[PDB]
Every structure is written in C-alpha cells, then in structure tokens.
Amino acid sequence: CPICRDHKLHVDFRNVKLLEQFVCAHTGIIFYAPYTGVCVKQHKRLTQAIQ
Amino acid sequence: SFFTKLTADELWKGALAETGAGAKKGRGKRTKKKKRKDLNRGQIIGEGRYGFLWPGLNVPLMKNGAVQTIAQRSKEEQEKVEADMIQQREEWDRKKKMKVKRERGWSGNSWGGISLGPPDPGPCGETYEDFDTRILEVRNVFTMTAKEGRKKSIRVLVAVGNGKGAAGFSIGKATDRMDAFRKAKNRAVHHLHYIERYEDHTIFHDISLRFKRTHIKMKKQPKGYGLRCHRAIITICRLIGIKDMYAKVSGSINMLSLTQGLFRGLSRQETHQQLADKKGLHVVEIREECGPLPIVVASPRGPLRKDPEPEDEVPDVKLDWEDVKTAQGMKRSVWSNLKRAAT
Amino acid sequence: EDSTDFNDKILNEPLKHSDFFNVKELFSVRSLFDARVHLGHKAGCRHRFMEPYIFGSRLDHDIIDLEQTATHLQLALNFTAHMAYRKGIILFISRNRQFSYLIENMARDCGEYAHTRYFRGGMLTNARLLFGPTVRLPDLIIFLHTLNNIFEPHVAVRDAAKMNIPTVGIVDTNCNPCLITYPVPGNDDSPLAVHLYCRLFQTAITRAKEKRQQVEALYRLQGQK
Amino acid sequence: AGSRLETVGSIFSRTRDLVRAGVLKEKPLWFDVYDAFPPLREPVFQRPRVRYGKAKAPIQDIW
Amino acid sequence: KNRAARVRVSKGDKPVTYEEAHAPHYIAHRKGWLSLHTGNLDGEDHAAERTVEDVFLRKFMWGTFPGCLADQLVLKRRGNQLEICAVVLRQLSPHKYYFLVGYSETLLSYFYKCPVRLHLQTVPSKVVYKYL
RNA sequence: AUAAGUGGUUGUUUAUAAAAAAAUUUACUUAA
RNA sequence: UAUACCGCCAUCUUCAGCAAACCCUGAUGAAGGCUACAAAGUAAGCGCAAGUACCCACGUAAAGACGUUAGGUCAAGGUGUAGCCC
Ligand SMILES: C[NH+](C)c1cc(NC(=O)CNC(C)(C)C)c(O)c2c1C[C@H]1C[C@H]3[C@H]([NH+](C)C)C(O)=C(C(N)=O)C(=O)[C@@]3(O)C(O)=C1C2=O
Ligand SMILES: [K+]
Ligand SMILES: [Mg+2]
Ligand SMILES: [Mg+2]
Ligand SMILES: [Mg+2]
Ligand SMILES: [Mg+2]
Ligand SMILES: [Mg+2]
Ligand SMILES: [Mg+2]
Ligand SMILES: [Mg+2]
Ligand SMILES: [Mg+2]
Ligand SMILES: [Mg+2]
Ligand SMILES: [Mg+2]
C-alpha cells in the first residue's frame, strides 16, 4: 500500500502534511481504506493519527 | 560443400516461415514465434577462432610508430576473448527477455483506458502536446470478400482532450491496429467540442439524454464527490476536465452510442449566464453549507426584468421513478454505493 | 512599439465605425426592385427555412421581402469590404452555367478568385493534399448560387462550415440558408439580379482594397513626422 | 487545429470557444470582423422537418 | 505465377536497387550481365570453369567484406586478367578496406593463378531505385 | 415451360523497441 | 513433417484488378464513395497498358499483380521442428 512501500512515511499525529492527504479537503472526512488502498493496519493507525 | 551454403537472409526467411499458407486465414495456430537474430551483431572483422592478430584489420596497424607484424594471442589469452564474447551475447539476450510493465487500462488485457500520447504534430508545425488520447474501444470487425474471404479490419474509438473543456472523439478503421490508432487519434483533434464546466469541476445542471437506445442520466454533484460513473465516462470526463459527477447508463451500452451521447448531452449544457440572459433575471445559488446567503452566480448583462416569474405551486415535471425510489429509501441494491478506489 | 500602432491604425480603426466603407450607398430598394431581386420561385418549391424572408405569394409565386434583403445585403457587403480590406482571399462559387463567364471575369477584375466549375471532393477539407501543405484557404466565400445543378445545396457550403470559413450567399426561396453566415434573400436566376450582385461585390471589394492602400499612405506621412 | 463539427454550434461559437480553451492560438482573419458586425441570425445547422397535421406555412397570398 | 529473381511488391516501403528491381526477362533489355567473359560465346570453351570461379568469388567477396557490399559484383575478364568491381559502403575504416583489397587480391591471384584486381567504389548509402 | 437426387467430419486472431568499429608523434641521410 | 518453410512453379490468368496515405458519407454501425449540361472523392505505388524480342504499327512470344486451391515439390539444393548415431 502507499504507506507500506516507503519506510520514510511515518504516520504520526505530528506529520500533519501526510495526514491531510488522507482527509477530504472539501468535506473533512477520512477516506475509506478502499479509497486510497492503505491496508487495514495503516488505515487504523492513520485514523488514530487524524483524531 | 562450400557451394551449398546460403546467406543469412535466405536462411532466416526459410526458418522463420513468416510467409506460407499457415499465416493466411489463421490456418497455423502455433503462437510460439521465433525472432530473427542478427548473427553478425557482435562480430568484428578479422576476429577468428585461432586468435591471430592482423595489423591494420583486427589490431591497430602501427604500434609505437612502428608497423606491427602478424601475431597470435596466447591459448590462455584466447580463452578469455571467447569467454567474454559469450557473456556479451547472453547479456544482450538478457535485455530482450526482460518483460516491460505495460500500464493497464480498464483491465489487464483491455485497450480501453490506455493512453496513446499526444496527437502527432501537424504538417505546418501545428502541435497538440496539450492533448491526451485514451482508447475507448478496439474491435475486430469483418467483411467478406470474393477472393480472400473473412477480411479483418480494426475499428478503434479514441477520445482526445486537454483537460480544459476541449475534447473530441473519432473512429479509426485499418487492417493494422497501429494504423487505426493513428487515424483515430489524429482525426479526433479536428472534431473537438468545448464542454462548459461549472466552476471547472462539474456540469451546470443535470443531464438526462437518450441517444438512440442508450440512456445517460448525469447528475451535478459538489466537490469531493468524484467521478462515480461508467468506466468510459470517467475516461472522457478526465479528458474534458470534469472532476465530480454521477451518471447512470441504461438501455444499450454500446461504447459508441455512449460516447456520441455523452458528448451531445454535454454540448447542450446551458450555462448560468446563458440562463440569466434567457430569463433576464438573477440566478441565485442557495448552498446548504452557507445558510440563506444568496450567492448570485450570474446576472443578465442586458436589461433586468421586474415581473416575478409565476411560481406554479405544483410543478408539471416528469420525474424518474428510480430517483424517487431511492429518495424514499425503496431502492436497496447491494451494488450501489460500494466502496471503490478514488477516480 | 510597432504592434500597437500597426494594429490600431490598420486593423482596429475600421472596426470602430458603423459603415467604414459606405456600402449602403451602393444599392437601394428601388435599385434592388428594378433588378427583379424580389422575384422568387413558386410556392411548391419553397424551403421552410426561407419563409421568414418571403413577403408573400403573388399568384403562387413567392415574393421575397426586399426590406430584409436591404438589411441583409448591407451586412453581407460590409463583411466583404472588411475582409477585402484585411487582405483576405475571397472565393466566388457558383454552378449556374449561364453566369460562369460573368462570375469568372468579375473575380479576375477585382483581383480575387472564382470556382464556377465542377467542385471536386475535398477542395477545402483536403486542400493540403490537393494543393500542397502550405496552401492558404479562402478567408471568405461568396456564393452567388447556393444550389448545385441538381437543385441541392452546393457541397462547398457545408465544407466551408467544416473549415470555419465564413460565407456570403444569395439565397432564393428554394435554397437552404441554415449554414450560410450572411444570407442575402434575393433572386439568383434573373440576369439583372446576378449582374447587380456582381457589380456590388466587385465595387465593395475594389473600394475596400483601395482604402487599405489609402490608409497606409497616411501611415507613410505619419511615419515621417 | 479547428473543429469540423459543422452541425454543432456555428463557426463563431466553435472558434470563440476554441480560442478561450487555448486550442486555436490565433483568432482567424474573419473573427474580429464577425464579432463587430455579426449577422442577424447565427448560422446554426437545423434539419428541415415536414409539416404534419394542421401545421401550415405562414406565407399569405398577396391580394 | 513466376518467382525467379522477382522482388515482390510489398507495401511501398521496401528499398530495392536497380539490379533487384528487374526480373529475368529484362536481362538483355534494361540491364546487363554481372559477369563478362568469352566462355558462353559460340565456339568458345571453358564456360563451366568460368562459372564455378564466378560462384566462388561472389561468395568469397560477400564474406570477406562483411556488411560492406552495396550491390552485386561486376566480374570482368580480359585475356589473363580478372577485374572485380565492387560497390561498397562508407562505414569501414579505409585502413580496413586497404587491408582487404590487398588481402583479397593477393589470395585470389594465388588461388586462380592469374592477375586479379579489385576496384572499389564507395557510396554513402545503398542506391535506391524504387520503393516497392 | 421435359427431366437435373446427393455431398461424414472439422476450423481462425492475447498485442512495441531500437547497438557501434576509428584516429599521439604532419620530411631526410648522419654521427658521438 | 510440403499442414513449419525458402527456393522454383501449377491454377484462375483465354483475368483487371490490388491499393498505402488522406478526405467525405452513414445520428461518427458492419460498411460506402457513382452521374461530364457531373451530385465527394484525391490517390503515390503494383499489375494491365506502354516499351522491348522475333520478320512490321500485324501476329507470335514474353509479361501477367494482390490473392485463391494448407495446390506441387523436405527425393534439386538449403532449412525450422522431431527422430537415428554399432
Ligand atoms: C487429413 N487431411 C485433412 C490433411 C492433412 C494434412 N496433414 C496433416 O494433418 C499432417 N499432420 C502432422 C503434421 C503429420 C501432425 C495435409 O497436409 C492435407 C490434408 C488433406 C489433403 C487433401 C489432398 C487432396 N488429394 C490430393 C488427396 C486434394 O486433391 C486437395 C485439393 N485441394 O483438391 C488437397 O488439398 C490435398 O492435395 C492436400 O493438400 C491435402 C493436405 O495438404
Ligand atoms: K527438413
Ligand atoms: Mg507460366
Ligand atoms: Mg442419401
Ligand atoms: Mg456439407
Ligand atoms: Mg503446399
Ligand atoms: Mg510451396
Ligand atoms: Mg490435419
Ligand atoms: Mg505487339
Ligand atoms: Mg506465355
Ligand atoms: Mg506488358
Ligand atoms: Mg497438401
């Protein structure tokens, strides 16, 4: 998946830029995992990070 | 015998068997195809098996300002030269066994969605590097002839577009695919529509059109919605510049009636200013995200009118059952609103 | 800065006047009427797209409304002059064999072009193959007859539209004006009418071509001072 | 480039729109003259239909 | 349909030389003989031995100047002499051409026991008569 | 306006590719 | 193994057609493209034709495309694939 193919991509609540990519810029919604393709593992970690 | 030996051209022509009755009418059905190898490729004039060094041909003529004499590489030295020659051949072959990753379109073996690059540059320096070209359909169509019989042609449908409202499509017919891609690609840029877009991301109103037996119900949506529409429409929308829309295709789904109808519906898309001018009244946008803020999107540049348009209490509009069906939570398709990749 | 001066003094100046070439003086409703421009075909030949322009039927002979012919004729002449002034290639197309000599002469006299002969397929849509890759196509096409010799629209009317070339056209009551940029409803059969159109389009072109010269001489005087 | 769709819009609208889009880099020689002195009716292609039923031609007889 | 020494039409994209572009019914009409000797004249001898020599030399030259020949050899004989007129390309080092001229001439003179000369005529590219 | 019956079986369109080899000392004999 | 082929041919052919590249038509379907007082076709090439051989402008040769018949020929030679090597 996008996150798991680049080790330098750390899904942290501090990495705001990365987090922004995975949220709608118009509706303020976190994309579903099938939308971006991030595995179940990373999407949950991402969800936590977003929150 | 020395005199029975032929040339590489004669040898490969026979060995490859490109011509013959097998090729015709697909009588031969052996997919495995050999390829001509140029066996002169790595060959150096003067280089032989014995390893002699001929001054002026195989080795340089002069050494240290002196003419070299006939010399022969050592046995151990010749082994390296022959061993090295084997390595280069193998690595040369290695390059041609590497499989190239062809970016796939709608499917792995499908031509739809694949890109053909920009249209070829015109005769008088006309350039089309702004435009992209995606294939919409490849079909082997046949006719019967008195002499041969089943004659294959390729009919190809492509769409071109710069992503800024200008787009077109054309059919290409030829016996070879690559000759039909050219014809279809280059003929399309001479048949460009301009598709007006609302805010350069969607359409102005909702479009309900029927081209022959194909129905297209297109819906204007907000931003972020994305292209939730038939895989051929998303392709054409990416070439026009529409980024958020919904369309359902009913009836027949002939790729060519879907395309010719999609472009026709979008061509009759009435703009907000064209509307203001036709009615001579302000066009006020009401957004739920902005409360009752009356956003005027277009005003009649000419004279404004004074008589409030009569508000008919009961609108005599013919509704679509599926729209109302879903509105009332009666449509329960296990396939609608499924999680899909971003388009 | 030569672009600002050249563009303004030559290209933009004439487009700022209602009648820069005074083409309204070239014709009058009395002149049109005396040339039998109001005489149309019979009512059984009528095209339904030519109805707006028909004043009526006088004993089953459509009478073209010369009041609209005048307003249309001025618009067609004005466009022609502006294009002749702008160094545009003007092609005169007809197939009425009675007037092929007249129209070919008139085209030579005003230094323009005529195609009064069998129109070969692709002259316009396939010109870079029929002539050469650097050929320049007409910027304006004047149809003095818009129907071919089987009473159907000349193929060039459609091909001009495909090539984005504006057209001027004399449209009788049996003709199809939907694609003609500047239709001029009037008789295209009577020699008096055809002579008049040739006289008008010749003058408009000639006059416009001189004035293009008589406004670059002023550029020369202005250039010195 | 150009658009040979003689049945979609007019030469003006098509040209105008292609200039806006950036396809046609140069306005054709006739464009400015048309824009200044447009014709009474825009030359848009229409298909001639037959009059069925009670539809009649509005042309009257000159008496 | 006849096949002998005909280059078929193909798709207007095949470069062919004047030599290749002519079928055997043009050999005394629009083109000449690639060899000239007296063996095949009425009353003359040794046509066979001339013919074996000509088949070898063409083969010899084709492999001795690999990839260089731009057309067919012209073989000539005058008395005791033998002339090989090649049209070659301009890709090999002139040093290599001189090596090969000196080599071939010498080797062939000792093989066929006669004075043998070799006249090269370089061209940039293969002269195209027609695109079949 | 005569009459003319029959022919085992079987069969077709899965996707693009490329080379170069090459160039230092441009005129003697001579001597210790 | 001619049903993997080159090479050389039979056959229609005692034929006149095969056509790349374009443009147009059909609502941008498979396809189609003709009128000379002409109405959408322009077409380079290849055949035919022309030229040449024989005693002529005649005749006879020769020529005769693309394809059709997996037509003939692995036994002219060469050769892909498979097999034999006391
Ligand atoms: C069994 N039939 C279907 C057949 C098969 C083959 N060869 C194979 O299938 C060989 N298979 C291997 C490669 C050995 C595995 C075949 O090779 C053939 C044929 C058919 C014949 C028919 C021949 C016939 N006469 C001469 C007996 C004939 O007159 C014609 C005709 N058209 O008139 C032929 O076609 C014929 O001569 C011919 O060529 C055949 C085959 O080629
Ligand atoms: K064999
Ligand atoms: Mg024969
Ligand atoms: Mg029976
Ligand atoms: Mg049967
Ligand atoms: Mg066979
Ligand atoms: Mg054979
Ligand atoms: Mg079989
Ligand atoms: Mg003769
Ligand atoms: Mg014969
Ligand atoms: Mg002949
Ligand atoms: Mg057989």
**Could you give the CA distance from residue A35 to residue A27 in angstroms, rounded to a whole number?**
15
The answer to whether the C-beta of E95 is closer than 7 A to strand F is yes
What residue has token string 């306005």?
Answer: D27
Q: How many CB atoms lie within 10 A of CB C190?
A: 14
Contact between D11 and C165 using a beta-carbon 8 Å cutoff = yes
Nucleotide F18: closest residue by CA–C1': B96
> In degrees, to the nearest 5, what angle opens at C-alpha B63 toward C-alphas B62 and B65?
75
Burial B129-161 (b: 16+ CB within 10 A, else e): ebbbbbbbbbeeeeeeeeeeeeeebbbbbbbbb
- Alpha carbon of D26: minimum distance to chain C alpha carbons (Å): 13
Say what angle helices E94-111 and E47-64 make with each other, to 10 degrees: 150
Which residues in chain A have Cβ-Cβ distances shorter than 8 Å to B199?
Answer: none
How far apart are the C-alpha atoms of B107 and B114, rounded to whole Å? 10
Determine contact, residues B136/B153, Cβ cutoff 8 Å: no
Q: Does B124 touch chain C (CB under 8 A)?
A: yes
- Spatial separation of the C-alpha atoms in residues C143 and C92, rounded to whole Å: 6
Q: Which of C99, C112, C102 has the alpha carbon at shortest distance from C204?
A: C112
Distance CA B19, CA B23 (A): 6
DSSP-assigned letters across all residues of C22-42: --GGG--HHHHHHTTTTEEEE
Is C88 buried (19+), middle (13-18) or exposed (0-12) by CB count in 10 A? buried
| Token duo for residue B127 | 């350039």
Ordered DSSP codes for B211-270: ETTEEEEEEE--SS--EES-HHHHHHHHHHT--SEEEEEEE---HHHHHHHHHHHHHT--
Query: How many Å does it take to go from CA E24 to C1' G49?
Result: 20
Residue range of the domain that includes C107: 3-222
DSSP SS3 for B181: helix
Question: Can you tell me which residue has the tokens 């409360």?
Answer: B291
Among residues C207, C28, C74, C179, the alpha carbon closest in space to that of D37 is found at C74
Phi then psi dihedrals of residue B120, to 5 deg: -60, 145
- Three-state secondary-structure class, residue B276: helix
Q: What does the alpha-carbon distance between residue D10 and residue A17 come to, in Å, rounded to a whole number?
A: 48
Stated length of chain E: 132
D9: left (phi over 0), alpha (psi -120 to 50) or beta: left
CB-based burial, D11-36: b 16+ in 10 Å, e otherwise: bbebbbbbbebebbeeebbbbebbeb
State which amino acid sits at residue C3.
S
Phi-psi region of C59 (alpha: psi -120 to 50; beta: other; left: phi over 0): left
Query: To which residue do tokens 């007889």 refer?
Result: D61
Helix (H, G, I), strand (E, B) or coil at B202: strand
Q: Specify whether the CB–CB gap between C139 and C83 falls below 8 A.
A: yes
Beta-carbon-side half-sphere exposure of residue B101 (alpha carbons within 13 Å): 1
d(CA D16, CA B194) in angstroms, rounded, equals 10
B residues 30-49 near E, CB within 8 Å?
40, 43, 45
Strand F reaches within 7 A of the B101 CB: no
CA-wise closest residue to B222 among B203, B239, B250: B203
Lookup: tokens for E106 = 């010498």
B117: the nucleotide nearest its CA (via C1') is F16
CA distance D27 to C162: 16
**Core vs surface per residue B23-62: b (16+ CB within 10 A) or e:** eeeeeeeeeeeeeeeeeeeeeebbbeeebebbbbbbbeee
Q: Are strands B166-174 and B150-161 parallel, antiparallel or unpaired?
A: antiparallel
Where on the phi/psi map is residue E20: left (φ > 0), alpha (ψ -120 to 50), or beta? alpha
Alpha-carbon span C100 to B95, nearest angstrom: 69
Resolution (A): 2.4
- CA–CA dist B337, B326 (Å, integer): 12
Report the nearest residue to nucleotide G65, CA vs C1': E9
Cβ-contact A1, A34 below 8 angstroms: no
Q: Quick check: B56 and E92 CB within 8 A?
A: no
Query: How far does residue E129's CA lie from ligand 7's centre (Å)?
Result: 30
Residues of chain B positioned with their CB less than 8 A from the CB of E98: 56
| CA pair distance C145, C193, nearest whole angstrom | 11
Show the CA angle centred on residue E96, arms to residues E92 and E102, nearest 5°. 135
Contact D3 B192 (CB under 8 A): yes
Q: Locate B309 and state its tokens.
A: 């348009």
- CB count, 10 Å around CB of B332? 8
Residues in chain D: 63
Own/partner long-range contacts of B275-282 (Cβ < 8 Å, ≥24 apart):
B276/B300, B277/B301, B277/B302, B279/B305, B279/B309, B280/B304, B280/B305, B281/B305, B281/B309
Mutate to test the interface with D, among B190, B193, B200, B259 (most CBs of D within 10 A): B193
Q: What's the total number of domains in chain C? A: 1
Tell me the one-letter amino acid at B125: G
Q: How big is the CA angle at E11 (ends E5 and E12), to the nearest 5 degrees?
A: 85
Residues ≥6 apart with Cβ < 8 Å to C199: none
In this complex, the answer to whether residue B274 has its CB under 7 A from any atom of chain F, a nucleic strand, is no
Cross-strand bridge partners of residue B211: B214
Indicate the residue type of B124: C
Q: Do the beta carbons of residue B174 and residue B166 sit within 8 Å?
A: no
Alpha-carbon distance of E124 to C35, in angstroms, equals 72
SS3 B132: strand
Give the pairing type, strands C113-115 and C90-93: parallel
Which residues make Cβ contacts (< 8 Å) with residue E105, sequence separation at least 6?
A: E116, E117, E118
User: Hunting for tokens 């009512």 — which residue is that?
Assistant: C43
CA distance A34 to A10: 20
| Beta-ladder partners of E69 | E88
Q: Which of residues 200-259 of B touch strand F (CB under 7 A)?
A: none
From the CB of residue C219, how many other CB atoms can be counted at a distance below 10 Å? 13
CA distance E67 to E60: 13
* Beta carbons of B259 and B157 less than 8 angstroms apart: yes
Q: Could you give the 3-state DSSP secondary structure of residue E85? A: strand
CB contact under 8 A, D57 and C46: yes
Pair of tokens at residue E107: 């080797």
Query: Could you give the 3-state DSSP secondary structure of residue C143?
Result: strand
Residue written as token pair 């330098």: A8
User: How far is Cα B194 from Cα D10, in angstroms, rounded to an integer?
Assistant: 12
Is the distance from CB of D46 to CB of C49 less than 8 angstroms? yes
CB atoms under 10 Å from CB of B20, counted, come to 9
